[PDB]
Design an enzyme around this catalytic site. Structure first.
Site, PDB file in Angstrom:
ATOM      1  N   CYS A  66     -59.617  -9.191  11.139  1.00 61.17           N
ATOM      2  CA  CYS A  66     -59.489  -7.926  11.254  1.00 61.17           C
ATOM      3  C   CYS A  66     -59.296  -7.551   9.712  1.00 61.17           C
ATOM      4  O   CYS A  66     -60.209  -7.798   9.093  1.00 61.17           O
ATOM      5  CB  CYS A  66     -58.045  -7.857  11.846  1.00 61.17           C
ATOM      6  N   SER A  67     -58.190  -6.721   9.252  1.00 62.48           N
ATOM      7  CA  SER A  67     -58.587  -6.188   7.865  1.00 62.48           C
ATOM      8  C   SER A  67     -57.662  -7.460   7.137  1.00 62.48           C
ATOM      9  O   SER A  67     -58.227  -7.713   6.055  1.00 62.48           O
ATOM     10  CB  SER A  67     -57.621  -4.981   7.809  1.00 62.48           C
ATOM     11  N   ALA A  68     -56.490  -7.950   7.478  1.00 66.91           N
ATOM     12  CA  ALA A  68     -55.886  -8.795   6.733  1.00 66.91           C
ATOM     13  C   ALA A  68     -55.984 -10.366   6.855  1.00 66.91           C
ATOM     14  O   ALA A  68     -55.840 -11.346   6.368  1.00 66.91           O
ATOM     15  CB  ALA A  68     -54.381  -8.863   6.324  1.00 66.91           C
ATOM     16  N   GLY A  69     -56.623 -10.195   8.302  1.00 63.57           N
ATOM     17  CA  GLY A  69     -57.020 -11.768   8.963  1.00 63.57           C
ATOM     18  C   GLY A  69     -55.657 -12.269   9.386  1.00 63.57           C
ATOM     19  O   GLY A  69     -55.605 -13.633   9.649  1.00 63.57           O
ATOM     20  N   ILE A  70     -54.527 -11.742   9.683  1.00 63.51           N
ATOM     21  CA  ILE A  70     -53.201 -12.473  10.427  1.00 63.51           C
ATOM     22  C   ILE A  70     -52.464 -11.534  11.567  1.00 63.51           C
ATOM     23  O   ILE A  70     -52.037 -12.311  12.331  1.00 63.51           O
ATOM     24  CB  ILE A  70     -52.261 -12.531   9.111  1.00 63.51           C
ATOM     25  N   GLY A  71     -52.993 -10.327  11.694  1.00 66.22           N
ATOM     26  CA  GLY A  71     -52.232  -9.776  12.915  1.00 66.22           C
ATOM     27  C   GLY A  71     -52.812  -9.661  14.028  1.00 66.22           C
ATOM     28  O   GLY A  71     -52.545 -10.457  14.918  1.00 66.22           O
ATOM     29  N   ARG A  72     -53.675  -8.634  14.459  1.00 66.22           N
ATOM     30  CA  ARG A  72     -54.839  -8.753  15.479  1.00 66.22           C
ATOM     31  C   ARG A  72     -55.320 -10.181  15.588  1.00 66.22           C
ATOM     32  O   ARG A  72     -55.719 -10.754  16.731  1.00 66.22           O
ATOM     33  CB  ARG A  72     -55.776  -7.655  15.498  1.00 66.22           C
ATOM     34  N   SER A  73     -55.910 -10.792  14.429  1.00 63.10           N
ATOM     35  CA  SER A  73     -56.659 -11.903  14.367  1.00 63.10           C
ATOM     36  C   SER A  73     -55.514 -13.268  14.925  1.00 63.10           C
ATOM     37  O   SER A  73     -56.002 -14.044  15.882  1.00 63.10           O
ATOM     38  CB  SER A  73     -57.048 -12.536  12.993  1.00 63.10           C
TER      39      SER A  73
ATOM     40  N   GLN B 113     -47.937  -9.651  12.985  1.00 63.37           N
ATOM     41  CA  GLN B 113     -47.261  -8.917  11.899  1.00 63.37           C
ATOM     42  C   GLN B 113     -45.910  -8.221  12.326  1.00 63.37           C
ATOM     43  O   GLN B 113     -45.496  -7.657  11.433  1.00 63.37           O
ATOM     44  CB  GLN B 113     -48.202  -8.031  11.237  1.00 63.37           C
TER      45      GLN B 113
ATOM     46  N   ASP C  86     -55.344   2.706  16.373  1.00 63.95           N
ATOM     47  CA  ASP C  86     -55.050   2.934  14.901  1.00 63.95           C
ATOM     48  C   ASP C  86     -53.584   2.372  14.534  1.00 63.95           C
ATOM     49  O   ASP C  86     -53.120   1.986  13.439  1.00 63.95           O
ATOM     50  CB  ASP C  86     -55.238   4.410  14.064  1.00 63.95           C
TER      51      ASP C  86
END
Ligand SMILES: CO[C@H]1CN(S(C)(=O)=O)[C@@H]2CC[C@@H](O)[C@H]1C2
Ligand SMILES: CO[C@H]1CN(S(C)(=O)=O)[C@@H]2CC[C@@H](O)[C@H]1C2
EC number: 3.1.3.48
Length: 284
Positions: free
Chosen positions: A215-222, A262, A181
């Protein structure tokens, strides 16, 4: 500089935040006018994460062709990816319309539906074989075929049917379920094992449309997923693998979608993943 020793040099000097801020300063800025139209407000999860106009995926619809999704096309590596936000209650039908129209084989999900006690994306796939989903706005049917639950990830086989033509296709859902998390994983080993499972399925290969990754925003983990994959492919293709410059590859990817990676912790984790991954490829 090489990667593994540039890495130790940033650790010993504690300058990850300064390196990451340099990337943010040099990153491309292109217009995202379609994303900001008033009619698209409920199609965006976050007001500060938008697709650029020049690289956005268009839906094949004459009313409103907008989805928060970008095509990342890596020319030297010969790989393409679609990066998108986690679907919203009013965009789950658009999401599967995109998968169909772009001829994707696989969907890569890097978040849980609930994290930190809040919803991070809609429940957009069926959880039981006998309870299929129908998306009436885009005329698609989605059925769960099988599910394989492992310790760090789950793989699902799904059937997507275009109800207009009665054509069907098999889609693979690769769900990484153990990203914490807060922060990043301590070791990249399970993330790399997951990447290799996606590769082995064919979902990243040129005989299919681009993989859809979110992912949630599609920039960090993605961003971490596609950056690691492309860097490892370039290390296999080139005569001199130590010439691969992860900061330069990230800036190339940021020509196609804003904000990839991010935090400075995500940047360090990406270095770690590429470094460890390059040892396993060999040729080990
Ligand atoms: C090792 O932990 C920290 C190291 N740096 S640092 C001091 O090298 O810049 C960054 C500060 C914030 C934290 O996430 C990480 C990343
Ligand atoms: C799955 O996408 C279909 C959805 N419709 S829709 C929403 O108008 O029913 C569009 C029209 C043509 C069809 O092939 C695509 C795009």
């Amino acid at each position: 500089m090489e990667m593994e020793k540039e890495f130790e040099q940033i650790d010993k000097s504690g300058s990850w935040a300064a390196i990451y801020q340099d990337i943010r300063h040099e990153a491309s800025d292109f217009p995202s006018r379609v994303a900001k139209l008033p009619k698209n407000k409920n199609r965006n999860r976050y007001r500060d994460v938008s697709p650029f106009d020049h690289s956005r995926i268009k839906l094949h619809q004459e009313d409103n062709d907008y989805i928060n999704a970008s095509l990342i096309k890596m020319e030297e590596a010969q790989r393409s990816y679609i990066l998108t936000q986690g679907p919203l209650p009013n965009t789950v039908g658009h999401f599967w319309e995109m998968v169909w129209e772009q001829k994707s084989r696989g969907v890569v999900m890097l978040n849980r539906v609930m994290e930190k006690g809040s919803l991070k994306c809609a429940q957009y796939w069926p959880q039981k074989e006998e309870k299929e989903m129908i998306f009436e706005d885009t005329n698609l049917k989605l059925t769960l075929i099988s599910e394989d639950i492992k310790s760090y990830y789950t793989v699902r086989q799904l059937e997507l049917e275009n109800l207009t033509t009665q054509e069907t296709r098999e889609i693979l859902h690769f769900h990484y379920t153990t990203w914490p998390d807060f922060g990043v994983p301590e070791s990249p080993a399970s993330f790399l094992n997951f990447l290799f499972k996606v590769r082995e399925s064919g979902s990243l290969s040129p005989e299919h449309g681009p993989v859809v990754v979110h992912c949630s925003a599609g920039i960090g983990r993605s961003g971490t997923f596609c950056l690691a994959d492309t860097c490892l492919l370039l290390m296999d293709k080139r005569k001199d693998p130590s010439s691969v410059d992860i900061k330069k590859v990230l800036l190339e990817m940021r020509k196609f979608r804003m904000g990839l990676i991010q935090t400075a912790d995500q940047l360090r984790f990406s270095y770690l993943a590429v470094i460890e991954g390059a040892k396993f490829i060999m040729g080990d």
